[model samples]
Target: SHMKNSVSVDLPGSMKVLVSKSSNADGKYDLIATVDALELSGTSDKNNGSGVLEGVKADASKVKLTISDDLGQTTLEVFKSDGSTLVYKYVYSKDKSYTYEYFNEKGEVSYKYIYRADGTRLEYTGIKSDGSGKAKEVLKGYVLEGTLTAEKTTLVVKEGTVTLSKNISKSGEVSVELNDTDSSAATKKTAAWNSGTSTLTITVNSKKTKDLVFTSSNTITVQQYDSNGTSLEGSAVEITKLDEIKNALK
Candidate 1:
């Protein structure tokens, strides 16, 4: 167990910080990164610690880590990074920068956003609205942003419309639909419909010029159903957000 890297800043008049990141702990698989009086401090589970990184915006705000099991289940861990490259990268808005994402082991965690302004209290809200995954001690400022990966996964988007596929509905007809807006198309994306477990993909043709805050929240409308579909009155299917968007530049 040793430090992989570390970083700090001492400005005498404005700043004093310390960040320590390490791996090869004990058996040489676990990981840990600690910030003394500034950044965050966290460790990984078992052999799960594969890689690590930090978030931007402030001294020791958060860390992002990736871990894997011998069984081949690769887990991306987001915690406090000492000096390693931060994962949830920052997007630029000229004089400003910002970052946001859904951070977690199962990718089910808090939503954190920083306008890249140091010392500004990182804003947060649990994507798991049951008050279950509420953050503490940086919490996704320690947001630990990652993919929205859950077996029984639910989703939340800041704005814009995302589509969902492979929905299992009460209708039992196997369905797909768009959430909170209209339907879209494909571009080298299978972009087709099916009778069961349908799917569609779209590539964003344009990139924004300014920094934007991406939050997760939205419910989809069942756009298509089997003609045998008896009651549209009440039946829902599964939905999901795009990893492409979630893992954008920041």
Candidate 2:
């Protein structure tokens, strides 16, 4: 729903392009176009400097460019000169923010920027890919929360966000993904919610668990428990809706 004016085109030499209009200034629309381009270098690392490297130069003549747009977001992937190896990706979001992700020789997201709306770094994670990795929030002092509903899946903080999704026909499943702005970790979790109890259970990687107990539509208390069901060594996290956090910051 974010993109009402968007277009995509593919040109010769495997080049692709995407153009979208984002805002209106008194009837004048702000538009931007993304295209496929890469600098061809000799003897470059096949890993794109993201992971373990294989020393060799790609077949420059075979390079390919692919672009994809989702809603108001656009992703441009540059394949290595050999035409099948993904070297790097550029992701542009609706708010004019974007991220750069580099893939390893094995095609994993090895390192990347998670950015804010104004195109500032939030964090970067990769290398030693156990437990989604962790990083520090480069931008601070922002918190976000919201009424998580089927229709509203994304709750955006200044430097982080939580994304919830449900697939009714696919076994009626609900899932959650979260990124913390301060000392961030990127992970996906299975989730369950009870409307009557206002308790939301999120199990991490099939084992570790936490609960988000909602006191109201706009407030939440996140409580963590050890495997033995004892409360973890910390006070529960309390957060309110994004507007509340913004208003309080003044």
Candidate 3:
């Protein structure tokens, strides 16, 4: 039976590194370093239960690297050498900040740093190991996805006229309302319901004229969804409205 084996190596410094494997069953296996520069590297020998690396430090104050197999996700964390205490953690993402604290001989949180992981490098600027200012840039890359929606309006009223408008604005908001005039009589308003849609209703009244005006507006919107409640992309949204008047004769 052939045993499965895995190996990882962590080299020191921000320089070029390489790894090579030799197997009895196969002549050899080779993996070239494609990264321009590396912050850390390591290998795991699952079959032999032995691994070695030059880059990663086993110090209690060193940072740790974690990798996920499911999504190929990677994260970093600062921890005490105790192997059980975590000082701070940071996940690879855009526009994120992380902080870590360390105590001095006086048992006070005298050391701290804020790590910012942008798209390119994981930069850290704060207290250094020697109790001095320090900064370092760890070269890394990640896979990510994001989406943003712009503000949109189905209808806009200006100069007593309705206008339809659409725009891609950084802010996502929409405001819609009906214009009212003094001559407009008090009326009972009823909005027509679409068997295929949801409805919204409002009411108004006048005591002096004893006039009842019923106005019905038909406007409905239906959102397309999948069986799992996930909305479909590029789905159509409908908007409609109407106004009318009715009065009781004395």
Candidate 4:
């Protein structure tokens, strides 16, 4: 997923991703991150004067990480560049709780993740960041593929990845609210695979998919249906836009 825009200057914005760890559950995390768009006002006057320089890549192989199996008291920061800009921080204090904070280039908070040795089956919440790197909204809750209860909804997407994507076994779930004016007008197909080479095509319409309001705040559920109006399996990881979803089930 990428794009470049020329607002007043060419290459005004660009989008890229940052991937770090491997997926934890079964092993081998294909960590993926998306940049909505990245461009900056720099001393070269890319803006406010608008000078330019391609982003330089420095040797990052020396980055250090500290981890523990038994929790204790420790706070660690991951920094990039001149050792002042914090990319992220993680804190642990016994079974007391766990916390994480992500920072933007300006050393500002971009996301705050929290877990209290708590309830509702599990208690985890991620507070989203605003453009100013301040808190905006809270997205709370997560479940693997098999965790959906009757009252809960699941959507197993087997196609592409965009944002808020999660996996269980093989398929992942992407969710959007029905009332939020989510337009499937842009959804498309990119080929599918099964045990066989024969193809499968799945089409989605915002209206055909039912919207489910969660008793939990900031949660919504959507399910896929075939041309026969039959149901498919999937669930939301709380993503707002689901790009391409192809059902290649046997």
Best by TM-score: 2
> Which portions of model 2 show Cα errors greater than 4 Å?
1-71, 118-121, 129-131, 140-250
Give the per-residue lDDT of model 3 (tens digit) for 129-157. Answer: 44433323232222111112222213222
User: Model 3, 248: alpha-carbon shift in Å?
Assistant: 34
lDDT of 1: 0.33
Question: Candidate 1: where are CA atoms >4 Å away?
Answer: 1-58, 71-173, 176-250
lDDT of 2 at 47: 15
Lowest summed lDDT over 10 consecutive residues: which window, candidate 2?
Answer: 44-53
Error of 4 at 77 (Å): 0.9
**What would the per-residue lDDT of candidate 4 be over residues 70-139, giving only the tens digit for each residue?**
2134344556766567787776555545677776667776566555444222222232343321111223
TM-score of 4: 0.25
Model 4 has how many clashing residue pairs?
A: 13
Q: What is the lDDT of residue 216 in candidate 1?
A: 22
Residue 172 in candidate 4, Cα distance off native in Å: 34
| Candidate topping lDDT | 2
State the lDDT of candidate 1 residue by residue for 17-91, as single tens digits. Answer: 233444344533323433223232344333333333333336454544322333222223334445433334323
lDDT (CA) for every model shown? Answer: 0.33, 0.44, 0.33, 0.34
